[PDB]
Amino acid sequence: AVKKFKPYTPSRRFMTVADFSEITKTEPEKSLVKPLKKTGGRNNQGRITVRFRGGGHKRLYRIIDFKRWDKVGIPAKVAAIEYDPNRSARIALLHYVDGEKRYIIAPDGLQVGQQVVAGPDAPIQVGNALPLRFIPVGTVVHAVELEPKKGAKLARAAGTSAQIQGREGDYVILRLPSGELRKVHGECYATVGAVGNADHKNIVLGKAGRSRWLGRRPHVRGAAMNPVDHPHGGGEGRAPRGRPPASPWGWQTKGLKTRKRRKPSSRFIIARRKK
Amino acid sequence: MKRTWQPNRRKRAKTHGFRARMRTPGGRKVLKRRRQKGRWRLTPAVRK
RNA sequence: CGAUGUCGGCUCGUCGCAUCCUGGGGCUGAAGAAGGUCCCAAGGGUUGGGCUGUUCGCCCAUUAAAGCGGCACGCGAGCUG
RNA sequence: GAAUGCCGGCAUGAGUAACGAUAAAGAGGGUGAGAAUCCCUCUCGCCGUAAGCCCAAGGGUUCCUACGCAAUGGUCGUCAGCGUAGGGUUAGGCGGGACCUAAGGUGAAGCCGAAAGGCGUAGCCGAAGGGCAGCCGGUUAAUAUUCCGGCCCUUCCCGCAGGUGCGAUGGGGGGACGCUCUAGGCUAGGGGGACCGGAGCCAUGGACGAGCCCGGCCAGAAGCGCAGGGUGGGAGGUAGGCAAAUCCGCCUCCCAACAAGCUCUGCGUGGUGGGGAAGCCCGGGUGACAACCCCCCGAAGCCAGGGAGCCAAGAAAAGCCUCUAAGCACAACCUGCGGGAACCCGUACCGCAAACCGACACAGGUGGGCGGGUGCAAGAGCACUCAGGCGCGCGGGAGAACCCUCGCCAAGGAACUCUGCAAGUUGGCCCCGUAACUUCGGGAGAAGGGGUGCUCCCUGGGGUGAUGAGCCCCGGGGAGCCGCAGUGAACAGGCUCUGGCGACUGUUUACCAAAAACACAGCUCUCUGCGAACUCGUAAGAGGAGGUAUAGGGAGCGACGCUUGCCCGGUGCCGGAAGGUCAAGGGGAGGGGUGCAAGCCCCGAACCGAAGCCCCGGUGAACGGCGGCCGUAACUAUAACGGUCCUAAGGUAGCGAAAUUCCUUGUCGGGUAAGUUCCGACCUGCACGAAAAGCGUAACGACCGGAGCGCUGUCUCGGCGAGGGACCCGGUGAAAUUGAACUGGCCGUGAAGAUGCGGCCUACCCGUGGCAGGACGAAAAGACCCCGUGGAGCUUUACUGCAGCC
RNA sequence: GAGCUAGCCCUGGCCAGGGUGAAGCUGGGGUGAGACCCAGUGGAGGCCCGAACCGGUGGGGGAUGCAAACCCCUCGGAUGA
RNA sequence: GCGGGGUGGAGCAGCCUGGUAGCUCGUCGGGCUCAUAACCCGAAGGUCGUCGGUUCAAAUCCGGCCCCCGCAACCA
RNA sequence: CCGAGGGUAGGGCCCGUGACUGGGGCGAAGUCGUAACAAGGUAGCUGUACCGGAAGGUGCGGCUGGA
RNA sequence: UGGGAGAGGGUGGUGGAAUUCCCGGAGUAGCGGUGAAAUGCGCAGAUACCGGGAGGAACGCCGAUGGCGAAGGCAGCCACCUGGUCCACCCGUGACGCUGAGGCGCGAAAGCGUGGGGAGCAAACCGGAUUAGAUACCCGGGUAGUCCACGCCCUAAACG
Numbered sequence A: 001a002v003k004k005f006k007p008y009t010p011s012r013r014f015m016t017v018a019d020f021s022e023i024t025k026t027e028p029e030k031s032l033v034k035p036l037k038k039t040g041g042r043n044n045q046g047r048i049t050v051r052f053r054g055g056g057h058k059r060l061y062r063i064i065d066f067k068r069w070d071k072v073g074i075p076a077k078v079a080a081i082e083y084d085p086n087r088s089a090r091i092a093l094l095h096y097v098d099g100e101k102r103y104i105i106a107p108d109g110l111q112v113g114q115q116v117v118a119g120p121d122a123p124i125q126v127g128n129a130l131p132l133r134f135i136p137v138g139t140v141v142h143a144v145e146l147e148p149k150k151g152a153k154l155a156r157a158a159g160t161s162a163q164i165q166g167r168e169g170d171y172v173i174l175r176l177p178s179g180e181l182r183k184v185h186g187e188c189y190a191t192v193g194a195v196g197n198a199d200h201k202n203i204v205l206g207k208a209g210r211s212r213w214l215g216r217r218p219h220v221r222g223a224a225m226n227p228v229d230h231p232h233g234g235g236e237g238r239a240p241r242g243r244p245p246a247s248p249w250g251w252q253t254k255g256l257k258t259r260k261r262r263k264p265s266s267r268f269i270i271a272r273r274k275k
Numbered sequence B: 001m002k003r004t005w006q007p008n009r010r011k012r013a014k015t016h017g018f019r020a021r022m023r024t025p026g027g028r029k030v031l032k033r034r035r036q037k038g039r040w041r042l043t044p045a046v047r048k
Numbered sequence C: 001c002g003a004u005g006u007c008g009g010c011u012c013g014u015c016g017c018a019u020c021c022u023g024g025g026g027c028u029g030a031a032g033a034a035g036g037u038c039c040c041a042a043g044g045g046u047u048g049g050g051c052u053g054u055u056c057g058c059c060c061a062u063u064a065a066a067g068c069g070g071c072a073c074g075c076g077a078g079c080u081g
Numbered sequence D: 001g002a003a004u005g006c007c008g009g010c011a012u013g014a015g016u017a018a019c020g021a022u023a024a025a026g027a028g029g030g031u032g033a034g035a036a037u038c039c040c041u042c043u044c045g046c047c048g049u050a051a052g053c054c055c056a057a058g059g060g061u062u063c064c065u066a067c068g069c070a071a072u073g074g075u076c077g078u079c080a081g082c083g084u085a086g087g088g089u090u091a092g093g094c095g096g097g098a099c100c101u102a103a104g105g106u107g108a109a110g111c112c113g114a115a116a117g118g119c120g121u122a123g124c125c126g127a128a129g130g131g132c133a134g135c136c137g138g139u140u141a142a143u144a145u146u147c148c149g150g151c152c153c154u155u156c157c158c159g160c161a162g163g164u165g166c167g168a169u170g171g172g173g174g175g176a177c178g179c180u181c182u183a184g185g186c187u188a189g190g191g192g193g194a195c196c197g198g199a200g201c202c203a204u205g206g207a208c209g210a211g212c213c214c215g216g217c218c219a220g221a222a223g224c225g226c227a228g229g230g231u232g233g234g235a236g237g238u239a240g241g242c243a244a245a246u247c248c249g250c251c252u253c254c255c256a257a258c259a260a261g262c263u264c265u266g267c268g269u270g271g272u273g274g275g276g277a278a279g280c281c282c283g284g285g286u287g288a289c290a291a292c293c294c295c296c297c298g299a300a301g302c303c304a305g306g307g308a309g310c311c312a313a314g315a316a317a318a319g320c321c322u323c324u325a326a327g328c329a330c331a332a333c334c335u336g337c338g339g340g341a342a343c344c345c346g347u348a349c350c351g352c353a354a355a356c357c358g359a360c361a362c363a364g365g366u367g368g369g370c371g372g373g374u375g376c377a378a379g380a381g382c383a384c385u386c387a388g389g390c391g392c393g394c395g396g397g398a399g400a401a402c403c404c405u406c407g408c409c410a411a412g413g414a415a416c417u418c419u420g421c422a423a424g425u426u427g428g429c430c431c432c433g434u435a436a437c438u439u440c441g442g443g444a445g446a447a448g449g450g451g452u453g454c455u456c457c458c459u460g461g462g463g464u465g466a467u468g469a470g471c472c473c474c475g476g477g478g479a480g481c482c483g484c485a486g487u488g489a490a491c492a493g494g495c496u497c498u499g500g501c502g503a504c505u506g507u508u509u510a511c512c513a514a515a516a517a518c519a520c521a522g523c524u525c526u527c528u529g530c531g532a533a534c535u536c537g538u539a540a541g542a543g544g545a546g547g548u549a550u551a552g553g554g555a556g557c558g559a560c561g562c563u564u565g566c567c568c569g570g571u572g573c574c575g576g577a578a579g580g581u582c583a584a585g586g587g588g589a590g591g592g593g594u595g596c597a598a599g600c601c602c603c604g605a606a607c608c609g610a611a612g613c614c615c616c617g618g619u620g621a622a623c624g625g626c627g628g629c630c631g632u633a634a635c636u637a638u639a640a641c642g643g644u645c646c647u648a649a650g651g652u653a654g655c656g657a658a659a660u661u662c663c664u665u666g667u668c669g670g671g672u673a674a675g676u677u678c679c680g681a682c683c684u685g686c687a688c689g690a691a692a693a694g695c696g697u698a699a700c701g702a703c704c705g706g707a708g709c710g711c712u713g714u715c716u717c718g719g720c721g722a723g724g725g726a727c728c729c730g731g732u733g734a735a736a737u738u739g740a741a742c743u744g745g746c747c748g749u750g751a752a753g754a755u756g757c758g759g760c761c762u763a764c765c766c767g768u769g770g771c772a773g774g775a776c777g778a779a780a781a782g783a784c785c786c787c788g789u790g791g792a793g794c795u796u797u798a799c800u801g802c803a804g805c806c
Numbered sequence E: 001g002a003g004c005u006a007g008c009c010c011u012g013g014c015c016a017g018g019g020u021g022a023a024g025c026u027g028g029g030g031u032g033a034g035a036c037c038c039a040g041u042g043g044a045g046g047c048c049c050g051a052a053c054c055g056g057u058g059g060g061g062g063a064u065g066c067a068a069a070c071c072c073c074u075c076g077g078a079u080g081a
Numbered sequence F: 001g002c003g004g005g006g007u008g009g010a011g012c013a014g015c016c017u018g019g020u021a022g023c024u025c026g027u028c029g030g031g032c033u034c035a036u037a038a039c040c041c042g043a044a045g046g047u048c049g050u051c052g053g054u055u056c057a058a059a060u061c062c063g064g065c066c067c068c069c070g071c072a073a074c075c076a
Numbered sequence G: 001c002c003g004a005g006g007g008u009a010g011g012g013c014c015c016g017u018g019a020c021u022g023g024g025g026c027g028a029a030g031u032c033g034u035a036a037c038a039a040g041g042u043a044g045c046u047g048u049a050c051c052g053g054a055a056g057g058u059g060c061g062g063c064u065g066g067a
Numbered sequence H: 001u002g003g004g005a006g007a008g009g010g011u012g013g014u015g016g017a018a019u020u021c022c023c024g025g026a027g028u029a030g031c032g033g034u035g036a037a038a039u040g041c042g043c044a045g046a047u048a049c050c051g052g053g054a055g056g057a058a059c060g061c062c063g064a065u066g067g068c069g070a071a072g073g074c075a076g077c078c079a080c081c082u083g084g085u086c087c088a089c090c091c092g093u094g095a096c097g098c099u100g101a102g103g104c105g106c107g108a109a110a111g112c113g114u115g116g117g118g119a120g121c122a123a124a125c126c127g128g129a130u131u132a133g134a135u136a137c138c139c140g141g142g143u144a145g146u147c148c149a150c151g152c153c154c155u156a157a158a159c160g
């Protein structure tokens, strides 16, 4: 769900926070956390390369297991469900019968104390990982490798999923969270079910300060600048664009398609995205 | 008000220092020039 | 143009008279009172407010009257701004 | 002889301004050639969440003592942060290094770049973060946790004893974490005492007193007591923690679990060692065999890795413990005791300032800790004051104008003015009470009122104790007293009604703009399938992101409410395997040059030939755009209606003389005695209008309008008073400016505004305080305007290139 | 050249005192069970008032300054972007 | 001050490229209808804002005069 | 002490009036159309929504008081 | 106690027909639409036909003048959970009843909020015709919406 507040300040009026209903552990696994290096959007030259970034809360990185075929046949119990500040999804703690402890992103309906497993033979149960080819057409799925053994790259965001539509040769057809219809290799792993914390998008930040907590620095409009800074800069008083809307670097920003035409992966994308 | 010179021994040695000069092409040319002129000091004085 | 600060206000005046008032006259379609119009006259006087940056103007309450112009549209090494 | 020339020297302004916070001085004594200024004493004032004390930057001998006064010191100087000389900084435990890592830097491997060089996992470097052993007093002119004294401790080396599978750069544990709130128990600190110790004191009317005044502790190993922190024990299995592992992890089983035990800190006590006031004598000595006790207040500090709640989800690595690997088990390690060993650097002094940053002994700037007492609700606020530190390095007079800062003011009360600008008013706390409207929070401190001191009596509850006394903290009810006045001093909202703009808290033009601008949650469009798009880079490599479409980039709009109409002809973007054009290249009808020829060489049409453009569609919260004329209703007027021209389509809702309206102070209504402003309406909207959003909107605003109440020196209209200056005397002594000057008025004249020319008028020679009309006064080679085939920023469907992309 | 200034990164530190009183929790009422209402408890917030601290709104002064941006009075924020 | 306009009664072609004025509505006569509108069949009406010129010839080309909308009026 | 009442401040209800504005009723022979009553020439009515000079139209569902 | 009929309600699942779109194949000169036509679509290969895929919505025949519910209303099939109701038997309780101002709950469609979904249909809107006009009727397009979840709205020719 989503928690509202009484309007006892101007900002509490619209602010909403997560209920954190599914969380069962309030601090992470020491062996599974490493220090996150905050960049501020600066590359190794130290130049800002992504604007308007920095100043957010300190975070620890929770090492996530995006392989899972790492430990085929070895079951694990769901020890806990935890908060992860580095992603939208919640994460679940797995104590394998191995005695090994790992983090995966928690699928919807995953419950603590249940058992999950990974492998070709695995049961079609929420929280189980299988190569795509062994998963029944039609079941919803997440954390999908894009290429075999290269790691789960698709559908990791809260509430997202992909759905298996059919098979062709060594490939299956997925409908991605975006509505793109794509061919992904049959030996690519994926976890059945959808990612949890679907209510995540219903969150209203509420005040400028909350964006600031998340490390998002204020975004200043092109139209608010000067010609030296931006195509939309200048003009006496307010001005309309006066040219096709452009980025600070001058390329067109309303409809100009930008994916490279001669990309090798074009052979594997059947239908470009939805809405 | 707060003025522009705010002395800092570590800052001084690290920025204008002999070793900072020696590491860079432009810095070595500085040393070469100040030696050519006959500068008594090639590098700012700082008590470290 | 190797600079003569530029509106209006305020302060401080001073001058002209083509005179607003006050004093003196002629004519009147001047009965009286009160006006009209011209002549002589610059000694003194020529209010307080509402509106507007305003000068000007309109308005309110008066007044003998609420003059008009010059002085770098008087006056920023006097003030305002 | 001129270049607002250059370097220097010396003038003028001028004995002029000034002499750097308005915290403030006076006298006596002394030193000396010389004293407002140095030393001493007494008296006065100033700071005291500092203007006192400690630490860190930074400075670098400025520190202490002797001897000096040319210069430095805004005056003086015998003095000094000045001159000369001598002296002065003492560590295993404090800080840093011989330890650890953070960003970042560097960088074996490796990658990239014409050269220079760029990058880069590990490793290394890197601290005000982690880790680690010293507290109290005494001593010097000057150092002290450093020397000395007392009591403690750490590591290394060697040895002895005991014990154990010893052994690591490898495994694991631990280190190891936020914000807000907060418990128990302590301590730092502080208040009181009729108790204890102490020189003395009795004044001027009273007091020989349960009088006054002073002081009543600090450090402390083991052990012990109190309060806390950390921590389960055993067994079996084991495939995970890149080898091993009895460790750790995972599963099972027995036992106990706000315990206890083991452990570690804090506080208390503690052998012992210290200190020890006023006052009075000369820093010292006495006090003094000083006493060293009880009660209360009590931290933000300590126990601390305590606890609870919340979301934005809160370093690393070593020390340390445990596990084992080679190895080695006459070794090694652990524990206890003993002896030996323990290095390098800093240590003076200034440190909110006269020694640091500001050219100055400059009203500015400068991080951390301590910061006492009383009263005022609290407090680091305010007033006074302790300790401590100062009177700010020119003074003495006078008692003008005028200036500044300040105080009061008859009657009036905004009549001032662009504007109540400024200054009044209000002002803390407790109680009563509090409207429209609203998003139900608010609007609220709404507004508006009442209370407030002191004394006596009665009484309720809490803390500490003991359940009592005492001390301490909340109160309540009677009855009185005084003054003009009881938050009696200081600190401490004026209020309301109504518009515009922006939702809000925020942000900005350092140094003329804080705003209606920027930002902002929120809304929409668009791009992006991940080796993402995009960005920086020649590249490698980075950011994006150790993220993955509920995500990331770009754009516009800007909480929220109700909404966001019509036009796709032009430009943009998107789609379109047709057709059209289209470069290199392919092709080679057909010519050409040369040669005796084979040959070599050259040109060359049709036709095949990408993207782009053309062409066919789509597309508005893409760029944008959203008519004209003529006629018509049974009074008139107007025109629901019609005619016609043009368009890609002719502006919908809602607004409207507006932050927009030219005519314009439109017209009408409101408010005023009077209203170019204001509010409400009307609508021929010069020239609103729907995300360069339209219309509203509670709350918010050092935003900009209009009005009213309150209260006023704003004003009628000024007056008086205070201090700091101005003035005078002693001291020190600038400045811009300056062709030279023996530098008057009028009316003329003159390059058209004359001290300088003409005519006339006036005028003894030289100053001082004042005022500003002139010297087209000063300052700045006008920033407006033009000129230069001068320059720079910026734009685009100007030209021509380049990157980038195709 | 980022010892000024702008942003970000790492690691530390700071914010007297007072006020308002959200969610939750407890009890009670309520209902078939609920919603929900009441009281207490509680201590949220780019909440309120106000020092330090960070500012720089209006006025006055200063203008060869104490200062090449200062001084006085007033005023903004002060648990947070 | 610069640009486009004036032509049957209304609103527009024709002008540029000289000879020949045309379109929709309106109006007039006739039809359909009980009647009116719509509809159907026919017709009338400009002498091209004016004066001046060029020409064999002027709506048309050139000049002035009258009017009608529009764009402009900036530096202080 | 209470106290008529005077005064200050803030509320509540009612009444009159107000530029302008909104529809309503009425009114012998106005303009535009023709929605409804005959299947009224698209059966009507309807709740609601959107739109349009106007009656109205259209969508969705309902009723027959229509076929 | 024993039994029965039923589209009564909620949840989860699931089946085939049709439409649309996409991909392949085959095939060519029109298709579509009307009163007639035009817009539209089609040599850039449409329509018509065959195979493949995706998605949404509604459930043909049974089906009735039928059934259930208090009403609004409820129709493929399966399972689960749940309401009403009729009959028999003649077993129990002993008037425990009827109605019901307030209150409370339910309440077709349209509509509203947040999030999904979106094939067909279709307010608004565009276009083509008709017409004196045609902001309509007819035709070709087409957005909310119609569908799902949660929360509002609380109306009706909510009628027998």
Ligand SMILES: [K+]
Pocket: D784, F075
């Ligand atoms: K100008």
Ligand SMILES: [Mg+2]
Pocket: A003, A004, A005, A006, A012, A013, A014, A015, A016
């Ligand atoms: Mg909320």
Ligand SMILES: [Mg+2]
Pocket: A004, A005, A006, E022, E023
């Ligand atoms: Mg709340």
Ligand SMILES: [Mg+2]
Pocket: A001, A002, A003, A017, A018, A019, A020, A199, A200
């Ligand atoms: Mg949630």
Ligand SMILES: [Mg+2]
Pocket: A018, A019, A020, A021, A022, A023, A090, A197
């Ligand atoms: Mg959750």
Ligand SMILES: [Mg+2]
Pocket: A030, A031
């Ligand atoms: Mg770790």
Ligand SMILES: [Mg+2]
Pocket: A044
């Ligand atoms: Mg780097």
Ligand SMILES: [Mg+2]
Pocket: none
């Ligand atoms: Mg670099």
Ligand SMILES: [Mg+2]
Pocket: A049, A050, A051, D535
């Ligand atoms: Mg960017």
Ligand SMILES: [Mg+2]
Pocket: A040, A041, A042, A048, A049, A050, A051, A052, A053, A054
């Ligand atoms: Mg950035």
Ligand SMILES: [Mg+2]
Pocket: A082, A083, A084, A085, A087, A088, A089, A090, A091
């Ligand atoms: Mg999460």
Ligand SMILES: [Mg+2]
Pocket: A144, A145, A146, A147, A148, A150, A151, A152, A153
């Ligand atoms: Mg992958």
Ligand SMILES: [Mg+2]
Pocket: A146, A147, A148, A183, A184, A185, A188
């Ligand atoms: Mg694949």
Ligand SMILES: [Mg+2]
Pocket: A018, A019, A197, A198, A199, A200, A201, A203
């Ligand atoms: Mg969530």
Ligand SMILES: [Mg+2]
Pocket: A219, A220, A221
């Ligand atoms: Mg922005």
Ligand SMILES: [Mg+2]
Pocket: A224, A225, A226, A234
């Ligand atoms: Mg701008």
